[PDB]
């Protein structure tokens, strides 16, 4: 059912994550971690102390899809190294701290199914459009997450307890 999901999302904040390759999103799914450049690191840390839920929604460039969404369970901290595949012109020290995350949905969602959702914080372009880190406004954020196929392998009871 959808009810506990609607509970987790209540008064959440949402952020579009754009990844260059599937390899890093797979690593995020397996280890429960994400890291960003300092510009986004700072904004995620503010949002983490400002809302009961900060949701990251992941998209792999050129995939035509979202790959799932997760909630932050900590602010960023500097631990066990993470063997990210780094783009041309980037090294591991340029990355910021490591955010812990609890996945809420690990299934895909194709852009064709979110083509009625516009993001007011990005000039009302379709929600799929946005730079890495772009905030998605509350109402669009919620409906985007509800569009995902349910992930019956996830139990939001433990997630609810961290709120
Ligand atoms: O915000 C970013 N997060 C990541 C995560 C993994 C390395 C590539 C990467 C990046 O280039 N930018």
Swiss-Prot record:
GO terms for molecular function: mRNA binding; N6-methyladenosine-containing RNA reader activity; RNA binding. Changing residue 59 to A: Does not affect ability to influence alternative splice site selection. GO terms for biological process: dosage compensation by inactivation of X chromosome; in utero embryonic development; mRNA alternative polyadenylation; mRNA export from nucleus; mRNA splice site recognition; mRNA splicing, via spliceosome; post-transcriptional regulation of gene expression; primary follicle stage. This is YTH domain-containing protein 1. The chain holds residues 345 to 507 of 727 of the full protein. Residues 12-148 form the YTH domain. The modification Phosphoserine is found at residues 80, 91. The gene is YTHDC1. Changing residue 37 to T: Reduced binding to N6-methyladenosine (m6A)-containing RNAs. Changing residue 132 to K: Does not affect ability to influence alternative splice site selection. Changing residue 44 to E: Does not affect ability to influence alternative splice site selection. Tyrosine phosphorylated. Keywords: Isopeptide bond, mRNA processing, mRNA splicing, Nucleus, Phosphoprotein, RNA-binding, Ubl conjugation. Changing residue 34 to A: Abolishes binding to N6-methyladenosine (m6A)-containing RNAs. Abolishes binding to m6A-containing mRNAs. Changing residue 34 to D: Abolishes RNA-binding and ability to influence alternative splice site selection. The YTH domain mediates RNA-binding. It comes from the Eukaryota. Regulator of alternative splicing that specifically recognizes and binds N6-methyladenosine (m6A)-containing RNAs. M6A is a modification present at internal sites of mRNAs and some non-coding RNAs and plays a role in the efficiency of mRNA splicing, processing and stability. Acts as a key regulator of exon-inclusion or exon-skipping during alternative splicing via interaction with mRNA splicing factors SRSF3 and SRSF10. It comes from Homo sapiens (Human). It is found in: Nucleus; Nucleus speckle. GO terms for cellular component: nuclear speck; nucleoplasm; nucleus; plasma membrane. RNA binds at residues 18-20, 34-35, 84, 132. Interacts with SRSF1. Interacts with SRSF2. Interacts with SRSF3. Interacts with SRSF7. Interacts with SRSF10. Interacts with CPSF6. Interacts with KHDRBS1/SAM68. Interacts with TRA2B. Interacts with KHDRBS3. Interacts with EMD. Interacts with RBMX. Interacts with ZCCHC8.
């Amino acid at each position: 059912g959808t009810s506990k999901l609607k509970y987790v999302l209540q008064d959440a904040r949402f952020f579009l994550i754009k990844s260059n390759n599937h390899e890093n999103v797979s690593l995020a799914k397996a280890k429960g971690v994400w890291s960003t450049l300092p510009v986004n690191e700072k904004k995620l840390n503010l949002a983490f102390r400002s809302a009961r839920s900060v949701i990251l929604i992941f998209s792999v460039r050129e995939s035509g899809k979202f790959q799932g969404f997760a909630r932050l369970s900590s602010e960023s901290h500097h631990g066990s190294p993470i063997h990210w595949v780094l783009p041309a012109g980037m090294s591991a020290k340029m990355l910021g701290g490591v955010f812990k995350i609890d996945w809420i949905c690990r299934r895909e969602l194709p852009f064709t199914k979110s083509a009625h959702l516009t993001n007011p914080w990005n000039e009302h372009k379709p929600v799929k459009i946005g730079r890495d880190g772009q905030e998605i406004e509350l109402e669009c954020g919620t409906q985007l997450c509800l569009l995902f196929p349910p992930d019956e392998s996830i139990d939001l009871y433990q997630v609810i307890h961290k709120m």
